[PDB]
Amino acid sequence: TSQVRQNYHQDSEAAINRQINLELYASYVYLSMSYYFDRDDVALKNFAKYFLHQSHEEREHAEKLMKLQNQRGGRIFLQDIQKPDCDDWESGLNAMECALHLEKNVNQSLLELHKLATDKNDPHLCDFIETHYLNEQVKAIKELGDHVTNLRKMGAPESGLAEYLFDKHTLG
Amino acid sequence: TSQVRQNYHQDSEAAINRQINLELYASYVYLSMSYYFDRDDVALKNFAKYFLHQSHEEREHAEKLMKLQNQRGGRIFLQDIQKPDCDDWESGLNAMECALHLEKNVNQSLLELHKLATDKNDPHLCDFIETHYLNEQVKAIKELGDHVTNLRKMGAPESGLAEYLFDKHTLG
Amino acid sequence: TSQVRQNYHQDSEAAINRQINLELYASYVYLSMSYYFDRDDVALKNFAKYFLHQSHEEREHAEKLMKLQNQRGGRIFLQDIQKPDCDDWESGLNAMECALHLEKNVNQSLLELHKLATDKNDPHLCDFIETHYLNEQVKAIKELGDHVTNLRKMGAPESGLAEYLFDKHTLG
Amino acid sequence: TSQVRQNYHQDSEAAINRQINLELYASYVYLSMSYYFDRDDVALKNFAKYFLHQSHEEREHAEKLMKLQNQRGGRIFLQDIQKPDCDDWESGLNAMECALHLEKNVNQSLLELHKLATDKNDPHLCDFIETHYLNEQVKAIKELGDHVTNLRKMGAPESGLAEYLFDKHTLG
Amino acid sequence: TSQVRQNYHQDSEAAINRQINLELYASYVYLSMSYYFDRDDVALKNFAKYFLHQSHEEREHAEKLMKLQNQRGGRIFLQDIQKPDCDDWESGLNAMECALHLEKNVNQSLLELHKLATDKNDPHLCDFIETHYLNEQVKAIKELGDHVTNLRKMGAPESGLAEYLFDKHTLG
Amino acid sequence: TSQVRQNYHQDSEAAINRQINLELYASYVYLSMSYYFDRDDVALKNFAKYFLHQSHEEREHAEKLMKLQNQRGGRIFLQDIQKPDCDDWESGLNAMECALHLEKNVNQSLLELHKLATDKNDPHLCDFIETHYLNEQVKAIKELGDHVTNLRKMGAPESGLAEYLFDKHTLG
């Protein structure tokens, strides 16, 4: 047992390790989406930048969980990072809809992590989740909802003009 | 024979002279396209700037081949610069499609030049082509593909609104 | 077939996709090594920074291959990123030795990629590999060899004083 | 007929198109002369710069005529650019003498263009020629005459010392 | 065998060691030429500076090959540096002609080195030669040809006025 | 006989020529030592810098003797530069000990040169040696003695920790 470990339940340590893999997976999903929009037959360069930025942020989220695991005296155990669900993401609106779905799934896992930390009376882990993850997830979900709404209202995905102008005026 | 000539095959010298004429021709094609978009009944001023810039670049490419010919001790032999295929380039999308076609033909000629230099064991000429021409061609072709894709998706060429907005937001 | 594809063999496209996964894996290995040295019972903070930097570089290498795949008109196909071989990397010297081994394996795969591009007469892909990958690999391998040599000569891994001072004076 | 066309005779439009080709040809002649002096067995680097600058200026003159053609509502029709008369220009003095001859021929064509515009009562085209072309031609011819005179008086072309010092002290 | 050595043939290692000695020899030749022009009965101070600069560059070329030898895990083996062919270099034109001859011999050895690296499928060594040596040699040979041409045309070596003015206006 | 020669004995001229070769040899020895410490299995980067700097200084010393030879109206006669005694210099302490030995041998030759100039009543050559060489040699020998002393006292060469820390704290 680690000389620094205090009030850190084995279930919490394992759930943090599962959260680490989920953030790496989400980073990988966003990376896949980014270079889809870099294709010569898709060619939405700000969609590609937007998702690449989201990819780097998710990987930063994963590294902060790895730091937290070591701060509390747990041990990081890494798993395979699963390849994303699709190779072809269809359209800008479809990608935005899949990102919304992904962020709500990450949010669900974070809420279950908070429930477990509360059940194990770990207020430091509760505050860690609240300070660095919960409002970031709410903000991301609201922003992705806004984007989906505007794209639908503009006439995406049938209107290629809509996705072109959204890429210019909202993501540029 | 020139006091500087070394490991420079007569076939290479002749192929460089053919490449010089092809770059001048491509410069001329882009010049023709540029002032088509300067017509009062076409009036896409950023299409005109885009192709004028491409015209000057191609002529710079030709001058660097002329410098290389003299660097290796060959002798420049110039030919007529053929007038371009069309006087009327139809639309922004059609011009972009003809430029893509032209750049792939220039790229094909450069690859045959690289094959010949490899067959004649001229590593200096091989590296010259690779450093200054091959990735520039790949970048140009990818960018022209992107442009063609966006214009088609926007509804060009029937939509004059699409070509107007592309001129503003991508080429401006 | 992509409007930009030219002189890009199907075998090359597939090998680039394999190289993309290998660089992501190496990024993951370095990430694992980094947070090993962040453990409270290891506590070599510059070893941790060194490997975290290597992790980010490898992921940049992967993204440049993804950009190249799209530049040539191939299609990125992603695979699972395998979890690294070890969870516990033993010591600073052992980690450096595993990194040396990993970089030589990445280098071997890059050389086989160059052989294939030469066999398919793809000079653009040959120069891409040479310009961005081959000398970077040689430099990394030489630097990791230097580090392994100094650590061994200092008396690592039995001397914890050696790894402490190496962390301060070479990696700090 | 173009919505902007006014007081622009069909003969003027055709003569402008002929002037456009003559300026492109003169640009090509100067380009050929420039890289002659870049040869390792000629090696007069300021002669080469002088003629390269003249080459770029002539091409700017051609582009301003293309702009004028569109400003008046005519239609540009391009022709082949004929390869220059010589491949080998003999000496610095001989090149200067051929440039003088070429500029006087361009000047003659411009004066016939002015006569035609006067005969067709096109004062805008008359002033265009006078403002941008006539005094530029007179200045170029006077400067080329000066150069020919100094080179002859110095003992060119038999004196290679004369052409060396002229390149240094007048063109450098 | 070195822990860093990979894909580095014994023949390549030996040829690099021969190239190292050839660059040191050329550095020595240029050093000898430099101080010839520093003699009170020769007294061409810019000829002396020009060749001293070339001497330092060649020694930098030798040191970069020594660095490359260690980067690839070969072992440097040094040989005597032979004294140059002449003690008395006759005239500025004669020295320039001997330098041209020397640079073409160095270039020949570099091309044979590139052939060997290609025959041993060492793309890293091929690119090393191309990036740092081949175009530098072509540039040096072209510049020395230019100098020889101007000196001959000026009337060197019988005209001591020509070598005086070349020293002032080209090398000063 | 040179128009500038005055009070310059033939024996002095010959001894200066021998001193020129000895300084070039010492420059070569230091160059060899430098890249020994650049080896991946030695890897003392400040030892390598220290000896490379000493290499450049010795070559500057040789060039100042060549300038002096011409200043006095003697004639430089160059000899082969002998390859250094060892290819493998064993350790940092062994290299420092060989450098000390080499500098004392160079110093001995300089003192014999001063004796000869005194015997030939050449006060200008006596002062040249004293101003530029004698105290530089004494300083170099004292500094190399200091280094040898510290390395021995630290436990070099058996202690690889000592050579590592000396490289960091004294030569870095």
Ligand SMILES: [Ca+2]
């Ligand atoms: Ca799967």
Ligand SMILES: [Ca+2]
């Ligand atoms: Ca025709």
Ligand SMILES: [Ca+2]
């Ligand atoms: Ca596994």
Ligand SMILES: [Ca+2]
């Ligand atoms: Ca290359």
Ligand SMILES: [Ca+2]
């Ligand atoms: Ca003809």
Ligand SMILES: [Ca+2]
């Ligand atoms: Ca007027």
Ligand SMILES: [Ca+2]
């Ligand atoms: Ca000899």
Ligand SMILES: [Ca+2]
């Ligand atoms: Ca010997």
Ligand SMILES: [Fe+3]
């Ligand atoms: Fe997240």
Ligand SMILES: [Fe+3]
């Ligand atoms: Fe899987």
Ligand SMILES: [Fe+3]
């Ligand atoms: Fe998020």
Ligand SMILES: [Fe+3]
């Ligand atoms: Fe081009």
Ligand SMILES: [Fe+3]
């Ligand atoms: Fe024709």
Ligand SMILES: [Fe+3]
């Ligand atoms: Fe191009």
Ligand SMILES: [Fe+3]
């Ligand atoms: Fe990598």
Ligand SMILES: [Fe+3]
């Ligand atoms: Fe697995």
